[PDB]
Amino acid sequence: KIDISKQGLNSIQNETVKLNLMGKSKTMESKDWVDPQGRKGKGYGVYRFANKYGANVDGYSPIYTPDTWSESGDSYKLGTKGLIAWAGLIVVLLGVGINLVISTSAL
Amino acid sequence: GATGERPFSDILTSIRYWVIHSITIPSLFIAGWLFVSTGLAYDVFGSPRPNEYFTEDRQETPLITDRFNALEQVKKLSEV
Amino acid sequence: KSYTYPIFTVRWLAVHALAVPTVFFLGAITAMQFIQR
């Protein structure tokens, strides 16, 4: 019912984090998998009815989908000149603010 | 899914967002500091400064007794 | 695919109406801490 590829989780660099966000783990479906305490697995995986319902709750309602992120915003259009102007403005504003705070107080 | 707005994770990790908001938040903080330090807070909302709690006229707590002359009574009680 | 989103929405106003006065009041309260009786 749920297509994992259409959930917008394909733009994640870390493979382990990507598998975590879809509620999937290739290691756990193996019949010889043993968790830290030492209990064998029954082959269910993360979710027993993963095939019946498509995916898990993690793969149903994700809260971090880089695919839906805006194409812009990963690069600043104003470039280096904008950053230089911002640096000048923030230095000037910090100086003005500290001067106003000192002047209006009782020294 | 999504209701048709930019994700909060996308906005909060933007150079444009942190360039715009490196000015607005400190500006508001400084504006509030100047509002308090310049004495505007006392005058706008009528709060007593530490030296204006008791005047030379009365050395007790204020008490308002009239409902329709309340404006004049509180004007008299606040006299410095 | 390309996703384009509006900048100003109802959520923008809802966020800012609670965010701006909060920062102003926090600055005022911080200034209040250094007043000597």
Binding site: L89, L100 | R16, I20, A31, L40 | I7
Partner: peptide, 30 residues
Amino acid sequence: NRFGTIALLAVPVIGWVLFNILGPLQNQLN
């Protein structure tokens, strides 16, 4: 004048925000 100081402080903030956001805002308006 005390309120004038705060208004004068707030003016460059509005100027900077308009300078940084006018383009995409006009794009969204159309």
